[PDB]
Automatic annotation (TrEMBL), chain C:
This is Envelope glycoprotein gp160. The chain holds residues 136 to 187 of 860 of the full protein. Glycans are attached at residues 1, 12, 16, 41, 43. HIV-1 lineages are divided in three main groups, M (for Major), O (for Outlier), and N (for New, or Non-M, Non-O). The vast majority of strains found worldwide belong to the group M. Group O seems to be endemic to and largely confined to Cameroon and neighboring countries in West Central Africa, where these viruses represent a small minority of HIV-1 strains. The group N is represented by a limited number of isolates from Cameroonian persons. The group M is further subdivided in 9 clades or subtypes (A to D, F to H, J and K). Inhibitors targeting HIV-1 viral envelope proteins are used as antiretroviral drugs. Attachment of virions to the cell surface via non-specific interactions and CD4 binding can be blocked by inhibitors that include cyanovirin-N, cyclotriazadisulfonamide analogs, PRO 2000, TNX 355 and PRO 542. In addition, BMS 806 can block CD4-induced conformational changes. Env interactions with the coreceptor molecules can be targeted by CCR5 antagonists including SCH-D, maraviroc (UK 427857) and aplaviroc (GW 873140), and the CXCR4 antagonist AMD 070. Signal peptide: none annotated. The mature envelope protein (Env) consists of a homotrimer of non-covalently associated gp120-gp41 heterodimers. The resulting complex protrudes from the virus surface as a spike. There seems to be as few as 10 spikes on the average virion. Surface protein gp120 interacts with host CD4, CCR5 and CXCR4. Gp120 also interacts with the C-type lectins CD209/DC-SIGN and CLEC4M/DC-SIGNR (collectively referred to as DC-SIGN(R)). Gp120 and gp41 interact with GalCer. It is found in: Host cell membrane; Host endosome membrane; Virion membrane. The lineage of its organism: Viruses, Riboviria, Pararnavirae, Artverviricota, Revtraviricetes. The CD4-binding region is targeted by the antibody b12. The 17 amino acids long immunosuppressive region is present in many retroviral envelope proteins. Synthetic peptides derived from this relatively conserved sequence inhibit immune function in vitro and in vivo. It comes from Human immunodeficiency virus type 1 (HIV-1).
Length: 53, 103, 43
């Protein structure tokens, strides 16, 4: 909805709700991982060489 | 390796393909000096006839072929491939000869 | 310098433990009180 005469001041730098956005994306990232597998037995001694090139 | 005259024969030489390659085909009549046929994968120098089919170089995991069409008795020449791959090192020796025995 | 009739309140033990990898294993030592270890049953 549109408004007439009323005039407010804004400030992007001390603005809030960006902080909770930065919290929420991190929390969503962490919630999207616990149903997936761990990679514990992979830390092991590797016998390595160069690829054929 | 033998087919009837006027026909096409299929001649392959060397390893399977790995990356983008450039092939070279040389021929040699017995008792004489060596001789060029095909310098790029499907390109031949001037003064040389057509009907020599080569393989494209883009195909991966294939073998280089050489198809001779409208053969004759003069085409009885020992053949030599020379491959250049972009993954393998430089081959300082030539490939294995595939002698043709014409009919 | 222990008197024979008094008993040690500290025991000194060494054992095996897995390292960060799975293949290596190491020998390490530590201290414990007598009220935490018991005798399994020469050596
Ligand atoms: C595979 O790897 C080898 C590496 O040994 C490549 O050989 C290199 O081929 C280039 C071709 O241009 C040589 O460059 C030349 O070097 C001289 C040195 O002064 C320069 O003056 C020439 O103008 C030219 O640039 C290079 O020396 C040579 N490497 C060695 C160690 O000699 C080869 O090209 C690679 N690829 C294939 C498909 O074999
Ligand atoms: C029980 O605790 C004692 C100390 O309270 C531990 O004994 C110490 O073990 C180390 C093993 O590396 C000994 O170090 C070695 O000392 C000799 C002395 O010259 C040196 O030449 C070696 O290069 C190395 O540094 C240390 O001496 C030893 N302490 C004493 C008093 O001998 C011990 O690990 C514990 N566990 C047991 C005995 O099972
Ligand atoms: C910690 O790990 C070490 C190393 O894996 C263990 O040392 C091993 O101990 C056993 C029994 O003490 C040894 O077996 C014995 O072998 C000797 C000769 O080989 C034989 O005379 C005995 O009858 C017995 O069979 C084994 O050889 C030895 N291995 C090494 C590399 O020293 C140790 O027991 C583990 N535990 C603790 C608490 O130290
Ligand atoms: C460690 O301490 C114990 C406790 O004193 C020692 O056990 C003694 O062992 C001798 C011989 O086996 C007995 O005569 C003593 O009566 C034991 N003491 C007690 C309180 O029962 C043990 O020998 C000690 N070990 C070392 C290596 O010092």
């Amino acid at each position: 909805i549109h408004l007439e005469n009323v005039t407010e001041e804004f400030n992007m730098w001390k603005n809030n709700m960006v902080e909770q956005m930065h919290t929420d994306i991190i929390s969503l990232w962490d919630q999207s991982l616990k149903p997936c597998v761990k990679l514990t037995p992979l830390c092991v001694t590797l016998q390595c060489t160069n690829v054929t090139n | 390796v033998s087919v009837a005259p006027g026909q096409t024969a299929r001649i392959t030489c060397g390893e399977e393909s790995l990356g983008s390659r450039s092939v070279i085909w040389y021929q040699q009549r017995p008792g004489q000096a060596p001789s060029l046929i095909i310098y790029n994968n499907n390109d031949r120098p001037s003064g040389i006839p057509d009907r020599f089919s080569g393989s494209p170089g883009s195909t991966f995991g294939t073998t280089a072929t050489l198809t001779i069409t409208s053969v004759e008795a003069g085409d009885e020449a020992d053949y030599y491939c020379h491959i250049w791959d972009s993954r393998r090192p430089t081959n300082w020796v030539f490939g294995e000869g595939t002698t043709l025995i014409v009919l | 310098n222990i008197t024979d009739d008094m008993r040690g309140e500290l025991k000194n033990c060494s054992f095996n433990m897995t390292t960060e990898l799975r293949d290596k294993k190491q020998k390490v030592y530590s201290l414990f009180y007598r009220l935490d270890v018991v005798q399994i049953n020469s050596n």
